Each structure stands twice: as structure tokens, then as C-alpha cells.
Amino acid sequence: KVFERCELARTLKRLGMDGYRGISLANWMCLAKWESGYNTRATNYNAGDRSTDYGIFQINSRYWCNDGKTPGAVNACHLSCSALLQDNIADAVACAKRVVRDPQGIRAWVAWRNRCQNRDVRQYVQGCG
């Protein structure tokens, strides 16, 4: 599923993401935009450690979910990676909330670092309302 922007923002707000561990809804939206284009089916293979990033938040299979083909997998979210490729993003949100406990916080996502960090992202929650 590809979310429409405001549709996604309302969903994330209902799931308590705005202000979660100090992260604004706008930053979560910018993260989703650049990691996956708001696409719950997005996947990306990392040839380096043979892991794959899954879903709307592109959550990685070496640390967070079990995909059955990544060496050294720890599965800290206690989910199959396929759960992160579903139209319903409840599991993805639960896992993302676990990821951000990291010392990095939202800096744990490289697309957020590259495209959202150091920028004004307020536009992602505007005009919805």
C-alpha cells in the first residue's frame, strides 16, 4: 500500500507517534517519505551484510525482524519481516517505537539523516489539517 500523506499523518497521530521519545510527527513523516515513499511494500537489499530493509520505515533484518535469510539476525521487535510488509502499519509503528529507544533516536535511519536532518520539516504535517 502507498499511503497518501495526510492519511498517513492521521494514522501515525492516532498511534501516538507525535512527540514519541521527543520525535515530532513531521519528522516521522519526512522519514517515511524518504525511506520508502510511504510504501508498505518497499524492500531494499544490502549486499554488504546480506540484510534487507522492510516496509514503510525500511526496518532492517539484521537487528529488528526475522526474514529467515539474514546471518546474525537478532529480531529485537519479535516480528517476521513479512509483518512489516502489510497494509496495516500497526506492527511497523510498534517496531519503529522500539528502534528509536536507540541512543541515535531517529538518527538510526539513514534516509532521515540524508534528507530530513538539519532541515525544516513542518510542511509534512501542514494542509491536512
Partner: protein, 98 residues
Amino acid sequence: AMGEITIKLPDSVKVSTNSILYKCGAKDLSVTYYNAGDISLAKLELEDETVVASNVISGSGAKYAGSVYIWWTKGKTASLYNLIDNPEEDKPISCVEQ
């Protein structure tokens, strides 16, 4: 002297080695990945240094840390951060698999 680091593991885990070529602007970058179960290392032959970085926890991508560098791949792209020259981490060198 020796010209090799030999890390003796305690079990019979499969060890794989894989060299991947990157282009970073106009320049070539050779990275060798070593994978042994839980362990994932990257040797980067940079112009200024040969670095061995270890895969570390990340939300997305495959992130390696070593010396003053972070090497962070996502799909076919990669960013090389230099935490001494660019501690603000907003000007990484951008690379792509060749």
C-alpha cells in the same frame, strides 16, 4: 611484517568474503565485506587510510563504524561520514555501487 589479520572464531561458522566496487564522485572505492554469522566487517581502502569497520545497530541500511568513519549503505548507495572533518555529519561523501 605479517600483512594479514587472522581472527580465530570459536565455532565452525561459515565465513564469506566479498569485494564490492564503488564510485564516489570521480573516484573508485574498493570495499571488502567479511561475514561470519553475527559478525560483519568492512575493509575500506580509502585514499587517506585503510580502515576496518564493524557493522553496528541501525534502523535502516547497513551501517559500519571504524576509526573516524561511518560507512552506511542502503541498497545501491552509500554515505561515508568523517567525524573528525565533519562532526556535524551533514556532509558525507556519496557513493554508488559500480
